[PDB]
Amino acid sequence: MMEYKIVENGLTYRIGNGASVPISNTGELIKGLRNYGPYEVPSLKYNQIALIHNNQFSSLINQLKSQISSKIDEVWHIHNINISEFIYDSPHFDSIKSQVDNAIDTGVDGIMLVLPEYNTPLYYKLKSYLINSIPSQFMRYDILSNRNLTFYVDNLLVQFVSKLGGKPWILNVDPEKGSDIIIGTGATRIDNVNLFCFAMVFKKDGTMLWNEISPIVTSSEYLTYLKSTIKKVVYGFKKSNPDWDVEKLTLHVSGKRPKMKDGETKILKETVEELKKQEMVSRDVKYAILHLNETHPFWVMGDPNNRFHPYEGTKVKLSSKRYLLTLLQPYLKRNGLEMVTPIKPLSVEIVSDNWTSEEYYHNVHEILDEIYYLSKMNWRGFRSRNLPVTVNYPKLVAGIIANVNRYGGYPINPEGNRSLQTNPWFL
Amino acid sequence: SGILYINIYPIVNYPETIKVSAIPYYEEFLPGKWKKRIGDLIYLYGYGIENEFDEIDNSNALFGKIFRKYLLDILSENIATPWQLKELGSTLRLVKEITENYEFSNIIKLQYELIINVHHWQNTNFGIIVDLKINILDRENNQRISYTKIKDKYGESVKKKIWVSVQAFHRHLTPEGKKYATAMRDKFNLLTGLLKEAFGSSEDEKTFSTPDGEIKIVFKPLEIVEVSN
DNA sequence: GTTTTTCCATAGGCTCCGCCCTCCT
RNA sequence: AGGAGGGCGGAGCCUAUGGAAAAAC
Ligand SMILES: [Mg+2]
């Protein structure tokens, strides 16, 4: 028989006016946003975004615009906002490109585009253009028609506020808790070829939040770029907050198993040696290379009154090096728990580490709680993805970039543009 | 406080030592049962030994891997009649045509798939990981088919019916296609029932014969306990 | 005379991509 | 592409262990 431990309770998001709301309850979060607004309300150059579509004289489009304005002004507190309206004759790339050019020429802070239906080459060939120029938010008219307008608009507005440079919420969690730096990994297989992407997440204001993103790297150049990433991320951390020392550096790997020696472990060990040679990291620096996994064959059954599912934050000890981590949970409603499909946990394995046996329990539990915490920092909507940010975001970036490359879109080079590392265009 | 279940099915009895005959590896090695490759040494076990056996206990690190493959081989010879051996290797694959009542069973062959693997932990505890999948086969050519291909070959209504039936056989949704409050418990009940039926067990505990002794499996989910620290 | 790559092999474990649906405050 | 989840189909990746060969030095 195995043992398990649950993340300590009391987890709350942080709101704009310094208050906090209970987690996992979306209605209370929306009420708190109405009362106090987002944690970081964006400052907008033009205070005016655009609504580009082709369904002119449509009541659904008018309701979409009204809901967008109402929620931007009231629940998101982006006051004095203005939504213009642009119409393209046909859904071909040329016409929508002309309309987004007109919207940019008028001067806008973001583009709120409505695509009539599902078309991958158009969508990527045009999203590559948008992310290279301005924050953007696509809609599908068929999906918008068949979905309740309130939930749809609220989720797209979470996405868009985050894309505009805002911070809807941050975890109200201990800042002296968990690792200092995390370098997550994500991959996409195109024609049996892996393209990898790195996310640089580290503590800026005590709170840990996603900071930078990397271009896609080939498997051959994966290790050298991981080395450069470690050096760059520790340099950036020391730049961001002096008076702090680098004590814990965790590295998250997805889509590939890490090599327990002569691989990611070798590169990370050599980088740490070099960094402590320049006295950039602490002498007692503790590192770990982690494997995150969802295609494991394991299923966990929980409390019968919790829909037979484990409570979120449950860490099941498969072995001393591999753990199962429950991240979702049935959400309460005005009437009760909601019917759910069986939920598969997250497999977390420590491929490599530098921890001594005395500190192992504390260090592994710290990294598991921090994975649970950065699970809730996903900003695509009110319900967060099971993946933590450190591996969720690079996976999205790798998918977008590979799709743009295969569909002939405008090249995306994150290294050239600072906003490409520093803004969640991929959400 | 509470109890969690993992779908790992514990093995409460196994031989303490087994007959293992390590021989030099060669390029003409045929990878099959009763023999394993670990580096330059090929280890013979069970009926594959050749009387130069070496007694190795569970304290050895060799025992864990040789016994993983040993369990995979032993359980491959206790398959009941309605189940058929699909593939034997790192995992044991058993398939069974779904003969329960579902519409369009005469054109779409839905079959179960028990993916069986061994989980070892604490250097002495072994177990069986059972994972269930449903294989959708186009019955006329008996070849694997997908929902989109079902809709292409037979229409939208057939595709919807087969989708609902598959998600109900997984017990993730209701037979009418909705979510419900006991899907996870029904999924575990389903896994336990198919494991019991696949290994011919009408009981919780079944024993399997092996040259080094006997293997006893619980055919129940493994409980997980809350530890406070 | 002397470490790196670069291919093999078996044993094991995922792991990406599509599309099919049920749900959301 | 508002997301979240599950399922299915399709390719394969990837680790570990060994092996050799080759070019170094
Ligand atoms: Mg998006």
Numbering used by the authors:
A (entry chain A): 1 to 427
B (entry chain C): 18 to 246
What are the paper's exact sentences on this?
Here we focus on the prokaryotic Argonaute AfAgo from Archaeoglobus fulgidus DSM4304. Although phylogenetically classified as a long-B pAgo, AfAgo contains only MID and catalytically inactive PIWI domains, akin to short pAgos. We show that AfAgo forms a heterodimeric complex with a protein encoded upstream in the same operon, which is a structural equivalent of the N-L1-L2 domains of long pAgos. This complex, structurally equivalent to a long PAZ-less pAgo, outperforms standalone AfAgo in guide RNA-mediated target DNA binding.
Next, we obtained cryo-EM structures of the fAfAgo complex with two variants of gRNA/tDNA heteroduplexes: g30/t51 (30 nt gRNA, 51 nt tDNA, final resolution 2.83 Å) and g17/t17 (17 nt gRNA, 17 nt gDNA, resolution 3.56 Å), and a 2.5 Å crystal structure of fAfAgo bound to a 15 nt 5′-phosphorylated ssDNA oligonucleotide. The nucleic acids resolved in the cryo-EM maps include a 25 bp protein-interacting fragment of gRNA/tDNA heteroduplex in the g30/t51 structure, and the full 17 bp gRNA/tDNA heteroduplex in the g17/t17 structure. fAfAgo proteins in these structures overlay with an RMSD value of ∼1.2 Å. We will base our further discussion of the fAfAgo structures on the higher resolution cryo-EM structure with the longer (g30/t51) gRNA/tDNA. The contact surface area between AfAgo and N-AfAgo proteins in this complex, as calculated by the PISA server, is 1380 Å2, and includes 15 H-bonds, indicative of stable association. Interestingly, the C terminus of AfAgo-N in the fAfAgo structure is adjacent to the N-terminus of Ago subunit, implying that both proteins could have evolved from a single polypeptide, and also accounting for the fully functional scfAfAgo fusion protein. The AfAgo-N subunit sterically masks the AfAgo surface that was previously implicated in AfAgo homodimerization, making AfAgo oligomerization across this surface unlikely. The overall structure of fAfAgo heterodimer aligns well with the structure of long-B Argonaute RsAgo. As predicted, AfAgo superimposes with MID and PIWI domains of RsAgo, whereas AfAgo-N superimposes with the N-terminal domain and the L1-L2 linker domains. Only the RsAgo PAZ domain has no structural counterpart in the fAfAgo complex. Similarly to RsAgo, fAfAgo binds the gRNA/tDNA heteroduplex in the positively charged cleft, which is formed by both AfAgo and AfAgo-N subunits, forming multiple van der Waals and H-bond interactions to the RNA/DNA backbone.
